[PDB]
Design a protein around this ligand. Structure first.
Ligand SMILES: O=P(O)(O)OC[C@H]1O[C@H](O)[C@H](O)[C@@H](O)[C@@H]1O
Ligand SMILES: O=P(O)(O)OC[C@H]1O[C@H](O)[C@H](O)[C@@H](O)[C@@H]1O
Lengths: 294, 170, 294, 170
């Protein structure tokens, strides 16, 4: 009866729209939360007959080390998706665009300059920067690629890791920066915006040297008895009206051509963000890269 | 005991809901002739609403919203977000249509067992969304999962909606 | 004293924002209206001492045959403009993006299909299509290019001109299609939305074969005693707050990176329009093209 | 004559504006103690507002807007876009701030000369924007270009704003 969904997203983003799907299709949806790679490992070791049905969130097209645990599928709506972010992976459908950002505590910042990864290396900021374990999370790993892609030097990744505190969970970074335990941290757009809107002294910085953009995906999980509504769920999440949702109510960046962006405050539109082009975008695969920066 | 308290509360809310249907019906032929821009007819609607509020034991707050009108007995402006939304209606009021929401904040029976028995209450829909809680550890709008649920409880379906009343002990 | 502005824009678009400039800078602004090339010709013959101060509207970067009538200038804001539409002409600053469209009367259309220029050539539509003189208007000229750019055959332009009724004024096309005198016409977004918002049975079609996108410009007119507020006007029209307004209040498509588009109701977003790329965009200059097709 | 009509109109509007300012001053020490969700205090505001409307020959409509309140004497719901906006005020009303707009729809004098003499009226600001017109050729919000037209006219500046009253013929 229950349609189970793995997601690294915070509840405040997905629970409301999945609730709307429960009411529309008369289904019960359970969410299993956790860091991206923790879910993928727990899932891999999970017995076929106890596996959930759907994986949403994370950069799935780039960090699934076990393709056999998923069912190939792409929705009919890829036609309406932005050309540059359509998935070239038969297990993953593109769902959202999510900038990775530096979050700065504006009460603690004072006159220190933080406009990128290089500024995070100012010795005054030593021990006062937080980020999440790149082995377990999409956020830490995507930031390490961005740090690596600056001048393609593994020394830059290590200099940052020596300079900053590693945390177990992505959501702990913005929380502790927001509350004044760290001057800055490496997070993503939606989590920063969430806390900025609650009133915390949070400034969102898109690194000038090159901002990494996450293309979040949705993937069907291979299990014994897949829920009959799970392909309706994927079409639903990629639908224009739901995307128009993610845009209006949550400030999300839609994957579709026909959904416009939203004039929000202190959140930039994509065309004003200094993104890393596909050109300078590191190549090495996930496991390879992680072993390289160890 | 718990099973007694669910029956009596399930029966009290049915009686309560029953009285609101009767109100809406009685005045389908009365409200169509009132204009809520006229201060004599506003008094006529408030008198009828407050009469309803006090013909039953539960603590109820009404919200009558529409074009440049907001009418309520929630004089201290308690947050309705923490109250059970219980019924909604579109009423024709001659000059326009007004939405009537009835909220339940508490009942004297649930307040009593909470104090005397430490028996708390939840109301949940068929998708386990919480629609009412008097225990601070659950909050409306979120979900309740009977997995993590580890208490003694009896549950019953309410007549007016696909909702379930759960009385549980800690 | 009075600051005079030449513009082919309809009053309902520029009059409100210029009004806001009048009582922000304590200036009187007069607008001289007319078809793009008619204004440019009248301006050319006008005495230096009797010329206005500013020209706004029209595809100025590409259809000024007399550069000597203008002052070189570009606002400091070009840095914030979209890279692909920044003016590479020293007399023109880019100001707006304006799709050229086909407007269809949905009361008359019936089951006739009009998805682009080729469909306009159905023999059933002969004598029932309207367009504006390509010699005098930005709109007629830009449509002829797009027709030409389909298959790069001058025979397509002539087949259309034999198939359709030419009108003197761009604004006469939408009015007469809107009121049911023509089945369809060639026009521009912003004038079609105008008539559609008044309740007329107007359908906006972005031609699949390819949609010409107009980059409207602003240029300083060379005169005897330029108005001291005229450079402040150019900076005002390219400011973010005014663009945001144009977006919010008129559904215009902004030239700036940092101004997001607005949401639907028949005006597609840019990424969902079938635009003619830089690739298939013909190369020939203004006067050459008019002579080629006449 | 036309010159006499502009002087008399200017002086009448000045007296009118004079009375509005008097109203707002008086009653500042009367509003801060009134609550507009109370039907006795709303009646007190209407009585004072209507008292002001009728100390004046000009036909005036008030709009008092705020949180879930709209108070006006525009009972036939005439479009305010065709009226002259005379003033605007923000009033402190104990429960909240409410905006008061005063509109001038016509004057008995301008209505009379238009009927008997075909002498029409315009009010324009310093940028030639039309703020009032009883001639169907001109519409509020657009520009008055005197050179496009040939009329007899006399104009005068009004005391309360950078506006010009124009009475003209032909
Ligand atoms: O804890 P995590 O694995 O990083 O989950 C959080 C992730 O949610 C989304 O998918 C975002 O695209 C990621 O940038 C973000 O990091
Ligand atoms: O076609 P005209 O009579 O020259 O009017 C020209 C108008 O429409 C064109 O399509 C331009 O995109 C507009 O910037 C201009 O205001």
């Amino acid at each position: 009866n229950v349609l189970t969904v793995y997601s690294p997203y915070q509840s405040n983003l997905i629970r409301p729209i999945l609730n709307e799907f429960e009411k529309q299709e008369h289904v019960k949806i359970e969410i299993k939360h956790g860091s991206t790679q923790v879910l993928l490992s727990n899932l891999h070791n999970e017995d076929f007959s106890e596996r959930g049905d759907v994986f949403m969130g994370g950069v799935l097209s780039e960090t699934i080390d076990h393709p056999e645990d998923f069912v190939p599928y792409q929705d009919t709506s890829v036609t309406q998706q932005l050309e540059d972010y359509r998935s070239n992976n038969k297990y993953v459908t593109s769902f959202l665009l999510m900038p990775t950002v530096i979050v700065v505590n504006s009460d603690l910042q004072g006159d220190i300059k933080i406009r990128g990864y290089q500024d995070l290396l100012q010795p005054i900021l030593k021990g006062k920067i937080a980020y999440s374990n790149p082995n377990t999370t999409t956020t830490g790993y995507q930031h390490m690629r961005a740090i690596y892609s600056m001048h393609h030097r593994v020394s830059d990744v290590h200099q940052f890791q020596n300079h900053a505190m590693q945390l177990s969970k992505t959501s702990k970074v913005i929380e502790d920066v927001a509350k004044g335990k760290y001057y800055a941290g490496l997070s993503y757009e939606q989590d920063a915006r969430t806390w900025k809107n609650k009133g915390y002294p949070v400034s969102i910085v898109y690194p000038i040297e090159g901002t990494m953009l996450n293309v979040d995906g949705i993937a069907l999980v291979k299990n014994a008895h897949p829920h009959p509504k799970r392909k309706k769920l994927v079409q639903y999440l990629t639908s224009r009206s739901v995307q128009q949702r993610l845009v209006a109510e949550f400030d999300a960046k839609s994957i579709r051509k026909d959904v416009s962006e939203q004039s929000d405050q202190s959140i930039e539109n994509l065309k004003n963000i200094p993104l890393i082009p596909k050109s300078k975008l590191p190549d090495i695969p996930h496991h390879k890269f992680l072993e390289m920066i160890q | 005991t718990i099973h007694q308290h669910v029956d009596e509360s399930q029966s009290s809310l049915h009686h309560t809901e029953k009285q609101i249907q009767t109100f809406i019906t009685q005045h389908n032929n009365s409200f169509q002739e009132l204009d809520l821009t006229n201060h004599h007819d506003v008094t006529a609607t408030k008198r009828e609403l407050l009469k309803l509020i006090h013909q039953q034991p539960a603590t109820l707050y009404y919200e009558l919203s529409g074009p440049n009108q907001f009418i309520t007995n929630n004089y201290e402006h308690l947050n309705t977000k923490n109250m059970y939304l219980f019924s909604t209606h579109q009423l024709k009021f001659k000059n326009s249509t007004y939405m009537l929401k009835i909220y339940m904040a508490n009942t004297p029976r649930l307040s009593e067992i909470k104090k005397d028995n430490r028996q708390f209450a939840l109301i949940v829909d068929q998708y386990d969304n919480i629609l009412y809680a008097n225990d601070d550890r659950f909050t409306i709008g979120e979900k309740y999962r009977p997995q993590q649920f580890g208490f003694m409880n009896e549950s019953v379906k309410l007549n007016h909606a696909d909702h379930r009343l759960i009385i549980y002990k800690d």
